[PDB]
Structure 1
Amino acid sequence: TKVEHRCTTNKLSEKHEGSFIQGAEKSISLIRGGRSEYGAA
């Protein structure tokens, strides 16, 4: 008598995370008249 029994398996996992934040700010200002300390402020 002869007997054989066998099994095999393959498995995977993956995970990801990602983030991207982007920003722009601009300001433009003009003042005329006044005194330079407060006009500066």
Structure 2
Amino acid sequence: EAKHCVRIETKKRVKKTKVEHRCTTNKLSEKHEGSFIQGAEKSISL
């Protein structure tokens, strides 16, 4: 996960002002599951 939020404000006067926000978020989840069962039988009878 990431949050990356930035904010800037500005004003100038003898009048102009800006207040501004931009921020972007990422999420990831990988999930893994695995199974392997192997087997062998021999039976030799006399």
Specify if TM > 0.5.
yes
Higher strand proportion? 1
Give the TM-score, by structure 1 length. Answer: 0.64
Moved over 6 A (4+): none
Higher relative contact order, structure no. (Cα contacts within 8 Å, ≥ 6 residues apart): 2
For structure 2, list consecutive stretches of 5 or more residues without a partner in the other structure: 1-14
Higher helix proportion? 1
CA RMSD of aligned residues (A): 0.9
The aligned length equals 32
